[PDB]
Amino acid sequence: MNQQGFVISNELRQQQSELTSTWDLMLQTRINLSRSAARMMMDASNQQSSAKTDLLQNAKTTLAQAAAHYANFKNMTPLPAMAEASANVDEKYQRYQAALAELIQFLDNGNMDAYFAQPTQGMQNALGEALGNYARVSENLYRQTF
Amino acid sequence: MNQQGFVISNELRQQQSELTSTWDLMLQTRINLSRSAARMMMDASNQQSSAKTDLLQNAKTTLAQAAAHYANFKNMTPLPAMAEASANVDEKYQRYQAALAELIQFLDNGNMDAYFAQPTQGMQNALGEALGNYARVSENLYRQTF
């Protein structure tokens, strides 16, 4: 229907929002984990809450928040035009969320070797790429509506 | 003019694009610097290009790319409705771009102490916040046009 433009617009609006929230968060989680891993050597110092003192904790919350965000995005059924794009993103998200979930495990148990061996970058890049696509396909939509 | 909707739309389209590119990049630069700082201790190993071996180099390019992006955004005069928002973002960007430029200096000269003392987070958060505003004000625009 004519007036339905807004309901199908705000939907494609929130799909983009929380999606950019997820990325912003996993991107902030990887930096938090590095601040913990970096300081888990010569410049340790802090004894109160050893290991999980400050940034490790902040990196558990940031992933938790990115999980909460995406959970909504996945809750919304993708438009027929965006089905193949949404899936590509979902898959790429699975790998990277997992990668970070394991980096948190690694930092919890002092597994530095494991930490620095996982090729986290490729999985981050794989997700960004899928994101740029979804966005392209997504913006195109409105342009194919004005 | 009536048809001008597209020229004023695509403009507010690219302003948002390259702006999200900048953030994505500084967010990727801080993670690169941590990978370098983290490994600039027990798990060094690599002798080819010591210090500036891999991630330090990648972190110079990512900032360089984020600089290139924003340079465009700043090149575009802000709409009367977005002037006060664009400025708030500019300022907050100045602090954080600088913060990262110095973390690169720190990692180049082995200044680990300086590296872990700068309160990078507050400046990142200060920028994200200003970004959420600009976005709000920016999205509102089209909604105040449909």
Curated annotation (Swiss-Prot), chains A, B:
Segments on the Periplasmic face: 2-146
Subcellular localization(s) per the UniProt record: Cell inner membrane
GO biological process, one term: chemotaxis
Keyword Metal-binding: no
Entry's Gene Ontology cellular component terms: plasma membrane
Main function: Receptor for the attractant L-aspartate and related amino and dicarboxylic acids. Tar mediates taxis away from the repellents cobalt and nickel. Unlike in E.coli tar, it does not mediate maltose taxis. Chemotactic-signal transducers respond to changes in the concentration of attractants and repellents in the environment, transduce a signal from the outside to the inside of the cell, and facilitate sensory adaptation through the variation of the level of methylation. Attractants increase the level of methylation while repellents decrease the level of methylation, the methyl groups are added by the methyltransferase CheR and removed by the methylesterase CheB.
Protein name: Methyl-accepting chemotaxis protein II
Gene (name only): tar
